[PDB]
Structures are given as structure tokens and as C-alpha cells.
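hiii so um. not sure if this is the right channel but i have a protein structure encoded as C-alpha cells and i wanna go backwards to a sequence. like what aa goes where. can anyone help
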């Protein structure tokens, strides 16, 4: 099976945008005790798949009038911090016993929720709402395998799971001439992760997560390690 370190490195492809102070401390709300006085959480922060959405949240707070003294002081140093998804995953796995642990709520990009529901309709299973962060995978046909792509200089292949539907539609377009039944499957990040945690199937080593075009572009702006 994939190790916890292997799963983290796959997840780390994907940047998550946190609303934080200038030192990266996330803006959060405290969590209540259970009815007897225990906790299954200390505080909760709102994570974003979209940097622009995170920033809009900050701009909204900054622009609100008649703020509290707390509100007021807080907004002065808020910014978006980009964190790899595997770091958050790992942190959640390693803080499970701390009852004051930080929890994260994830906001998917609105366009991708809409895209996910549209695709679900054209597979027979309309939904009235979508939970979790969707992902999109191109298949040769509804009953057939996931389409791989060529990567690097050699003959290595990966099976890409897209966080953005437009990127999956792109690959669909390349496959569809020779595979007229090709389609995009709607997945979600929790379901994929539980598969990577639960299976020994060796081909899952090929799975990669592809973040949105905006995140890929943003990531290209950043200093990186050797």
C-alpha cells in the first residue's frame, strides 16, 4: 500500500489557502465542549481551494464597518498563506489525540461544485447538492479504466485527478476522437484519500493530484527548494 509519507507527497501537489496573520497563525473560532465537558476539537479554521476567494473573505472583513475592538485589531494583519494539502493532512493525523486540536473546514471553488453536479446529471445520477471538494478523472468509458498521461522525458505515466473540471475537459477532448464513449467521472477528495489509504493495488503509485490553473500559476511564482 501507499505509505503515509507517500500519501502526503501526493496531497502536497495541491495548495490550500488559509486566512492567517503575518506569521501564518490561522484565523479560527473556538469549539465548544461536548455536553459533559470533553472536546473533539479546540478551534476551527476555514480553508480555501481558491486564493482569490480567501482574499475576498479578508477584503470583506476589512471593509465591514462598525467592527468590534477584536475584529478591528485582527483585520489589520490578515493575509492569505499557501499550505500544501499534505501538511494539513499530516497535521490532522498527528493531532487526533489533542482535544484542543485545530480542525479545518474546506471551501471548494464554486465553479467546480456547479461543474460536478452537471457531470453527475449526464451519468444518470443528478444530485441536489455536492459535499466535499470535487475531483475529475477522465475515463475511456463509464465502464472502462482511467486514462493515463505521458510525463517527464522517459516513458513514465500518471493518472491525473483534476481539481478543476476545465482541465479534465481538456484531456477528455484529446481522448474522445479515438474513444467516443470517453467521459469525466466525478470524485471527491475524501473518497480518493480513503482509496489511497485502503488499497494495495500498485498502480495507485501513478495517481497524481492536479490543482487548478490558478494554483499552478501561483505556485510557479514561488521560491523552491534545491
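sure thing!! here u go:
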Amino acid at each position: 500500500m501507499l505509505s503515509e509519507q507517500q500519501i502526503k507527497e501526493k496531497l502536497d501537489s495541491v495548495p490550500i489557502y488559509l486566512v492567517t496573520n503575518e506569521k501564518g497563525l490561522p484565523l479560527s473560532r473556538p469549539l465548544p465542549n461536548a455536553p459533559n465537558g470533553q472536546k473533539a476539537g479546540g478551534s476551527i479554521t476555514g480553508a480555501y481551494m481558491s486564493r482569490q476567494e480567501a482574499q475576498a473573505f479578508i477584503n470583506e472583513l476589512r471593509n465591514a464597518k462598525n467592527k468590534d475592538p477584536k475584529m478591528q485589531e485582527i483585520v489589520k494583519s490578515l493575509q492569505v498563506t499557501a499550505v500544501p494539502l499534505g501538511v494539513i493532512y499530516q497535521q490532522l493525523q498527528q493531532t487526533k489525540k489533542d482535544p484542543n486540536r485545530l480542525l479545518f473546514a474546506f471551501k471548494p471553488v464554486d465553479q467546480e461544485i456547479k461543474g460536478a453536479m452537471d457531470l453527475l446529471r449526464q451519468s444518470g445520477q443528478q444530485v441536489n447538492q455536492f459535499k466535499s471538494v470535487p475531483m475529475f478523472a477522465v475515463r475511456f468509458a463509464p465502464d472502462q479504466g482511467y486514462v493515463p498521461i505521458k510525463v517527464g522525458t522517459g516513458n513514465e505515466q500518471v493518472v491525473p485527478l483534476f481539481l478543476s473540471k476545465q482541465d479534465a475537459q481538456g484531456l477528455l477532448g484529446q481522448v474522445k476522437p479515438k474513444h467516443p464513449k470517453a467521459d469525466i467521472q466525478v470524485l471527491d477528495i475524501d473518497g480518493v484519500l480513503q482509496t489511497l489509504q485502503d488499497k494495495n493495488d500498485t498502480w495507485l503509485n501513478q495517481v497524481v493530484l492536479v490543482p487548478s490553473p490558478e494554483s499552478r500559476e501561483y505556485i510557479r511564482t514561488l521560491p523552491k527548494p534545491p
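oh and Residues 1-226 form one domain.
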